[PDB]
From a paper:
The protein SidK, secreted by Legionella pneumophila, interacts with the V-ATPase to inhibit acidification of the phagolysosome in the early stages of infection. V-ATPases pump protons across a phospholipid membrane using energy from the hydrolysis of adenosine triphosphate (ATP) to adenosine diphosphate (ADP) and inorganic phosphate. Removal of the C-terminal residues 415–573 of SidK did not significantly affect V-ATPase inhibition by the SidK mutants, but truncations of the N-terminal region of the protein has been demonstrated to prevent V-ATPase inhibition. These data show that binding of the N-terminal domain of SidK to the V-ATPase is responsible for its partial yet specific inhibition of V-ATPase activity.
In the absence of ATP, V-ATPase adopts three distinct conformations that correspond to different rotational positions of its rotor subcomplex relative to the rest of the enzyme. While V-ATPase particles decorated with SidK were found in all three rotational states of the enzyme, the highest-quality cryo-EM map was obtained for V-ATPase in rotational state 1 fully decorated with three copies of SidK and reached a resolution of 6.8 Å. A pseudo atomic model of the V-ATPase:SidK3 assembly was constructed using the cryo-EM map to guide flexible fitting of the crystal structure of SidK determined here, an earlier model of V-ATPase subunits A3B3CDE3FG3, and a model of the VO region subunits ac8c′c″def. The fitting shows that SidK binds the V-ATPase A-subunit primarily via its first α-helical bundle (blue bracket) and the three copies of SidK each interact mostly with the corresponding N-terminal region of one of the three A-subunits. The C-terminal region of SidK is poorly resolved in the map and has lower density than SidK-N, suggesting flexible tethering between the N- and C-terminal regions (grey density).
Author numbering:
A (entry chain S): 17 to 163
B (entry chain O): 337 to 392
C (entry chain b): 400 to 423, 427 to 480, 524 to 544
D (entry chain b): 710 to 808, 816 to 829
E (entry chain R): 1 to 213
F (entry chain a): 11 to 158
G (entry chain Q): 1 to 345
H (entry chain T), I (entry chain U), K (entry chain W), L (entry chain X), M (entry chain Y): 9 to 158
């Protein structure tokens, strides 16, 4: 029954990472007096990009919860892989949301100062969202290779 | 200009004297004090012969 | 404190050096250095050498009496001291009986 | 005005009565500490000084006795400088039941006059 | 067992120092307890030859109370920065800062979120919700309710904290005059779905631990 | 059997949160009351609203204390910890938010008589978090008698 | 980081300071006020600010001399004593040191002016939260270091004048308000880095480090340019030389400031500043105000931190001088020179 | 057996993703415009995000190989030898991501004014990114002897 | 069998990669700060990052040599040896990288201020690798007895 | 047991960390003093070479402690070498920590006046007794660790 | 038996070496700072480093004397008096070195301006040596009672 | 029995020596600064260093008295009574020394300006010996009841 | 069990001596700092140190009374009521000294400006000193039941 904590701890880091990223983007989108030209024109990509991190860990927690049953092979002890899968997806989603919030917090404020850096901030924010896929791919590859 | 200034200053340094010759190369100027100009009214570098540094 | 006969601290000259001398023959060097200050009181009173020698020269009588009384308690220690838990049974009640 | 003076004198006498006997126990501690610190070096120096007869006993005994007496005089001066607890306790606690720094100046001024 | 009285005193002592940390300086947390637990765990972990692990079965307690307490404790802390800013505006403007109180209901939904799962997490019993390893088997259903309620409580607390942080910046929404608060409310409305999706995905991923006869 | 610390944690956390909220509401009410003396009765609502949260922890602590000393077991000593922790954390968070909300409502009501209805509405609406934890603690404490 | 601090004291002072910071003169009001030359257009844009409440109560079209000083004194006293009186804890105690550091410069000049035999019957307050009759007359009347240390010890917390009085007690820095003002500006610049380094764990600060570094470099370049042509002593500390960024050396700032005239530290410090190769005091004065005015509106975007209140408290000094210069120039029927050259607000 | 060793595969990309997130987070912060425009250093500043993400991309192969080598059932012998390769790539990816984050922040702030430091700043992250490759090589060498356990 | 010496291979590369990353970040900060004033010393100052980055090769070679000396059975004479032997070279490389970063920052700023400091900073930075060489020699001597598990 | 390898390995890590901090402080003081006058850079380099000599005691003590290791691992051979190595490691770390402040103060004070080089060289040369004392204590503790079972 | 009595012998030399290192650093900082402004007090200011450096001989002699009393075959009750006397001698040497460092720095800084306080700084600096002698005497008295058992 | 009662006797000298060292350092720090203003006030201000350092005799006498009572054999109930006297005398001497340090520094700084406050500063510091005398009497009474046979 | 009574008897006098030392230090700091400005207020401001120093008699008499009932051998029933009464007396003395210290320092500092609040500070200290007397009375009532066994 030790494998239930690994499945329950899957989206706990992705939800706090996406909540901290959306709170960092919403806290960084307060300024600065003008909202017609640029905000939100290309600044909403960080909240929608970091929003799928909780859905990836929720889908991985649903797949790991559906894969783990009390009538399968559970006398090994071999149920330690659920903690590595859920913690692996949770650390990747929390690091992706934490990096997405820090990138969106400076990228949202950097657009009002100089308009030429909007393509650069969106270019770095688009590339920074690919960190969370490794925990979901490693969690699905780890869950596919076992029971 | 550092090799020609050190070779020309070392070669022609014995004409003026052995106590006023020193090794130097190039021309280093500063905003607080322009050095390497061979001034005769203010404090600056001096050599045994006439030597001027012109940078175009 | 400008009393003519009492009270000005007359018991401190006997209770002060006698109780102060019990904390210390280690008192022989203090009796010799205090005895040098008797002959050196005249030139040392007008010399003013050092900072501790000035206050020591002002209280030369207290250092002579306390230094002379320190030789008895200093030579008495080192009944007899051989180990712990033996001399402490008499040294413990000796300070209470003296106090 | 004697009401607060009576309770302050009763509480001060009750505190100083146990404070005198409680404060008087430092004599055996200081004497045992200085006597142990002197007898440790003397007992650990006399035996090493007395061995190896000849010139090694004179040079090692003189060099050991000089460094032993040199630290012993500084330790005795350190204990004599640290022996002001009887003057502080006699000036603070002893001055209440008998009657400041007036007794220390009066002790030196008593022998002068 | 000693894990009940140790986890209860550690849980009360952690919330006591954690609650007294942000309060006035009357007590401080033990900083040496992390290095002492790390050195004691690393020292006893290496020597001798053995695998360190705790072995409870269900413990029956922390799921329903931990879910509703973690959700209510997280939801109750979000309105502090929003109400201080909305009332902190004052007479500076009659604008949408006094009409943006819909985020306080979204932060108030985090109290019911997790408490409804804690209400649904107990069917016809209050000491044990399912079979335990004291007179029966299959204690994994009662074991997973603690991690499911802790994950749903932490997710509802993080969604309520993010909703309160979005509402505090959505209170004024403008650094200068002539500003609109709909842009901050649009981003603040996107953070309220994390509590519902995290509570539905957390409650669905945890199964059920009720109906114990 | 360790339900005594869980039963005392409700009144401890509710007393600490109500003490901090009454301290901050009394500090802000005392600071804002120096300007105008008419706003004392309007500013005194946050301390009385924050101090009413102790009744839920006292009633839950009395109800949890009533089931201790006459009947107890291994499975009947876990609901009191979560029931006390829920009302304690809800009362502490409600008092901590009610302190800053009472100070901001006291400053807004001290500025003009417009935000006092909003601060009184938010302070009157903040009791639902403590009422939900009190209802969850009463619901968990009510089912504490199944066998024996 | 974000999401780990729950300081309600910084949230209360951030909302109370945000309520007065909301209805204030922005960059569009300063740009429209500088280009405006009409009484209705100038009073209409400045009337919607915090200082425009006195213009709303007492309607006028021409800005007077006493009206700008009374409105600026009531705006600074209402913006400083109101926020300082309503704050408590480490936010109010740390916020009181910012007003004490600004009032310590006028208190040191009044203390040196009292021994200098100069007249004093009216003193204006810029950012000092204490009046000029309770704390300023007691410290200004006293001339001994023991009375200044005893009067400074009664206040909670200690002001920055205790270190300047302790350094000036041995006669190690200067015997005037110039060297004590430069050493007090250097110690005040180091105190912001010490407080920012101390509060770096609990609160997240990113704009306060860039604004403190740019304000420290502009304050060091302005302090070095202020001592140029004023007979500055090379041995005594009068240029405010210290490491704050990493590209400013003390020999380049003190040597180029004292008698060298070397502007290589300006171009070596950065290329995005207003002055990096200039040598005029007029262009360097507007470039220092434009560089000090930057990092103020961008720092106000982030909330729940003292970095926005630190730049917001420093923006009132340039906003009061810009509003007083624009109101006095537009009211006096003239054109602005320093206000027209500045465009960064 | 206890089946200890499955946490090593999941712990590999944790420090690498945290190091790359700290690298892109520390590189994205700071101002990059001088007055109204820049020197076109926005295309030069995109290299630090790929350089910080390269440590996580190289660290993901160690977690994929450890996850493929983990399996459903394994003994304590292969599980004990299998665990440990992820922490070496994770610590080097976190340290190289932190040094690439500080070098990207200083090279971005100094690179905003003048782009002359991009030659050294581009080689600094390339010379610092070898820790993830060495940790992935040591994780591959440690995982090469953990296959076919009994 | 029971074994706990698997973390010794990544323990040297973790501290060596962290110290080399901290020294490379500290050298890149001073090189980036000194590159703004004088752009001539950037190529000369870029050598200290590559010279500081050679400390990871001792931990990587010690980790590969410690992992190569692992057999099919675990005894009490091989476990706990690679943790101390690799931990000594890891701590020596971490201290050498930590001193190399502080020496590289002050050497880069002082060398950018006045010339002739590259010989002293390169002399101290080149002389700081003796602790890593002695720790690598002690790690090789401790790693030489890690085989022959009874 | 079998855990004396970290204690035997930490002795060179402590002296290497103290010598690294001493070389860091000596390089910081030499870098700060070389800006005003680049004529005494060779004189200020004596502190890094003097601080770096303390690593040879922990390296030789670690090699001598590693050479005395037998073929078995018990609880009697993993307690003396840990304290013996930790003693020389802490003594080398304290001697390097004092040599860093002494070399930084001597290098910083040597810029304005080079007359303090005799006192700074005397205190820096006199502060190396802690490594020899910890090495002698590690050799004395290592001498009683024979006959390991 | 455990044979863990070496921690008391190592803690005495560790605490005495740390206190002597901090006292020698604190005395050398004020001596090096005061030696520049006044070269006449160079020979007078050297007494604090020599007085602070003598604290290491008490912990080294206590560790060398405690090392001989350990024995080739350790017991369970043997490592108690050496641990208490070693911890007491280590704390006494660390407190004596910590007080000797601030007393030497304050004595050198106060003696740099006026040389009249050399007697008070010499007596106050010499008066703090009784702590290491009392802790070394207590460690010798506890070491004498640790050789009769077994 | 284990005979681990040496920690209670050794625990007193660490806190007593640390408190006396901190009080002697706090008095010696202000003594050199107060001696510069007046040369006659040096001997008057030097009493607080000996008064702060005089508290070590209680922990040294308690540790020396409890050291000889250990021997070789012990009981299960022997070793707990001396820990309360040692910890109580150590914490009382450490707190009395810590308060005597700031009280001696503030009394020396306040007495440096006005010489009339020396009697009040000495009288205020003279009352601090009751805590160390009460803790030393409680430690002596606890140490006297630990050994009842032989 | 061996013994558990000495922890409360040591913590009682340790907490009372620590609270009385902290209150005496905090009162002597403000009394010594405020004594320079007003010489006539030196006798009035010295009441807080002497009034704060009398709090150690409760923990000293409670520690002597608890130590008088404990000999060489004891049971385990006294080591819970003795530790509870000693912990209550120690917490009451520490709370009384900590509450007395700030009121004594604030009273001594505020007494220099307006000499009319001395009765409020003396009544505040006399009303705050009863907190240690209540814990001393509870420790005496709990200590009265600790002499029935043994």
């Amino acid at each position: 029954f030790f494998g239930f904590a690994g499945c329950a701890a899957a989206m706990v880091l992705s939800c706090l990472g996406a909540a901290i990223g959306t709170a960092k983007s919403g806290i960084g989108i307060a300024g600065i007096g003008t909202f017609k030209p640029e905000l939100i024109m290309k600044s909403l990509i960080p909240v929608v990009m970091s929003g799928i991190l909780a859905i990836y860990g929720l889908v991985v927690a649903v797949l790991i919860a559906g894969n783990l049953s009390p009538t399968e092979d559970y006398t090994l002890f071999n149920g330690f892989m659920h903690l590595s899968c859920g913690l692996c997806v949770g650390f990747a989603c929390l690091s992706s949301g934490y990096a997405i919030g820090m990138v969106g917090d400076v990228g949202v404020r950097k657009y009002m100062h100089q308009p030429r850096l909007f393509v650069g901030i969106v270019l770095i924010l688009i590339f920074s969202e690919v960190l969370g896929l490794y925990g979901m791919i490693v969690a699905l590859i780890l869950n596919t290779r076992g029971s | 200009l550092s090799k020609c200034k050190s070779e020309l200053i070392d070669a022609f340094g014995f004409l003026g004297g052995n106590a006023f010759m020193k090794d130097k190369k190039g021309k280093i100027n500063k905003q607080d004090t322009s050095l390497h100009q061979y001034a005769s009214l203010v404090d600056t570098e001096y050599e045994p012969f006439v030597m001027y540094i012109i940078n175009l | 404190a400008q009393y003519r006969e009492i009270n000005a601290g007359l018991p401190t000259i006997v209770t002060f050096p006698f109780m102060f001398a019990i904390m210390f023959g280690h008192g022989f060097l203090m009796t010799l250095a205090a005895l040098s200050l008797v002959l050196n009181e005249k030139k040392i009173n007008k010399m003013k050498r050092g900072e501790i020698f000035d206050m020591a020269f002002t209280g030369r009588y207290i250092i002579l009496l306390m230094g002379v009384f320190s030789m008895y308690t200093g030579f008495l220690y080192n009944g007899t001291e051989n180990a712990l838990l033996f001399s402490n049974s008499y040294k413990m009640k000796l300070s209470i009986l003296m106090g | 005005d004697i009401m607060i003076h009576q309770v302050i004198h009763t509480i001060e006498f009750c505190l100083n009565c146990v404070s005198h006997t409680a404060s008087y126990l430092r004599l055996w501690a200081l004497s045992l500490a200085h006597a142990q610190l002197s007898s440790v070096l003397w007992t650990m120096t006399i035996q090493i000084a007395f061995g190896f007869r000849g010139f090694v006993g004179v040079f090692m005994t003189v060099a050991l006795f000089a460094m032993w007496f040199a630290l012993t005089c500084a330790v005795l001066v350190l204990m004599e400088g640290t022996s002001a607890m009887l003057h502080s306790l006699r000036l603070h606690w002893v001055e209440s039941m008998s009657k400041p720094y007036e007794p220390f100046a009066f002790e030196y001024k008593d022998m002068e006059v | 067992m000693n894990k009940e009285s140790k986890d209860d005193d550690m849980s009360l002592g952690k919330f006591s120092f954690s609650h007294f940390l942000y309060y006035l300086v009357l007590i401080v947390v033990i900083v040496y307890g992390l290095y002492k637990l790390f050195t004691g765990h690393g020292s006893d972990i290496n020597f001798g030859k053995f695998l360190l692990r705790t072995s409870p079965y269900m413990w029956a307690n922390l799921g329903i109370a931990l879910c509703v307490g973690l959700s209510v404790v997280g939801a109750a802390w979000g309105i502090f920065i929003t109400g201080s800013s909305m009332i902190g505006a004052g007479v500076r403007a009659p604008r949408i800062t006094t009409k943006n109180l819909i985020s306080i209901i979204f932060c108030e939904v985090v109290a019911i979120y997790g408490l409804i799962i804690a209400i649904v997490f107990s069917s016809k019993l209050t000491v044990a919700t399912a079979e335990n390893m004291y007179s029966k088997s299959n204690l994994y259903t009662g074991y997973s309710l603690f991690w499911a309620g802790i994950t749903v409580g932490a997710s509802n607390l993080i969604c309520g904290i993010a909703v309160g942080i979005t509402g505090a910046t959505a209170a004024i929404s403008d650094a200068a005059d002539s500003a609109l608060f709909v842009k901050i409310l649009v981003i603040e409305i996107f953070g309220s779905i994390l509590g519902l999706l995290g509570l539905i995905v957390g409650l669905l991923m945890a199964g059920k631990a009720s109906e114990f006869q | 059997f360790f339900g005594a610390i869980g039963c005392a944690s409700a009144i401890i956390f509710t007393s600490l949160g109500a003490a901090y909220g009454t301290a901050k509401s009394g500090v802000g009410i005392c600071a804002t009351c120096v300007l105008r003396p008419d706003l004392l009765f309007k500013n005194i609502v946050p301390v009385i609203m924050a101090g009413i949260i102790a009744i839920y922890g006292l009633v839950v602590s009395v109800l949890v204390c009533y089931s201790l000393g006459q009947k107890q077991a291994l499975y009947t000593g876990f609901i009191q910890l979560g029931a006390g922790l829920s009302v304690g954390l809800s009362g502490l968070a409600a008092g901590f938010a009610i302190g800053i909300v009472g100070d901001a409502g006291v400053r807004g009501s001290s500025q003009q008589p417009r935000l006092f209805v909003g601060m009184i509405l938010i302070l009157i609406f903040a009791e639902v978090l403590g009422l939900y934890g009190l209802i969850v603690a009463l619901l968990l404490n009510s089912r504490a008698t199944q066998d024996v | 980081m974000e999401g780990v601090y729950f300081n309600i004291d910084n949230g209360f002072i951030e909302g109370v300071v945000r309520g007065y910071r909301n209805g204030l003169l922005s960059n569009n009001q300063y740009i429209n006020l500088t280009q405006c030359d009409t009484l209705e257009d100038l009073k209409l844009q400045l009337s919607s600010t915090d200082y425009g409440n006195f213009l709303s109560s007492v309607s006028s079209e021409s800005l007077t001399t006493s009206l700008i000083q009374e409105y600026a004194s009531s705006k600074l006293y209402h913006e400083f004593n109101y926020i300082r009186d309503q704050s408590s804890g480490s936010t109010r105690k740390f916020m009181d040191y910012i007003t004490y550091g600004y009032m310590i410069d006028n208190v040191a000049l009044m203390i040196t002016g009292t021994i200098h035999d100069r007249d004093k019957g009216e003193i204006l307050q810029r950012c000092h939260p204490l009046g000029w009759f309770d704390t300023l007359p007691t410290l200004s009347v006293a001339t001994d270091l023991e009375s200044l240390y005893e009067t400074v010890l009664v206040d909670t917390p200690l002001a920055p004048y205790f270190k300047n009085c302790f350094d000036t007690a041995e006669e190690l820095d200067d015997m005037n308000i110039e060297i004590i003002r430069n050493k007090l500006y250097k110690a005040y610049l180091e105190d912001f880095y010490n407080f920012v380094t101390e509060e770096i764990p609990e609160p997240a600060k990113e704009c306060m480090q860039t604004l403190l570094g740019f304000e420290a470099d502009r304050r060091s370049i302005n302090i070095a340019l202020n001592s140029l042509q004023s007979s500055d002593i090379d041995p005594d500390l009068k240029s405010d030389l210290l490491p704050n960024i990493g590209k400013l050396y003390p020999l380049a700032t003190f040597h180029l400031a004292q008698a060298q005239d070397f502007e290589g530290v300006r171009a070596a410090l950065a290329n995005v500043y207003e002055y990096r190769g200039f040598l005029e005091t007029g262009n360097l004065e507007d470039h220092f105000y434009q560089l000090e005015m930057e990092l103020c509106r961008d720092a106000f975007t982030q909330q729940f931190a003292i970095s926005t209140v630190w730049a917001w408290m420093k923006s009132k000094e340039q906003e009061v001088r810009n509003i007083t210069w624009i109101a006095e120039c537009i009211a006096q029927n003239q054109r602005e020179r320093i206000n027209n050259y500045i465009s960064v607000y």
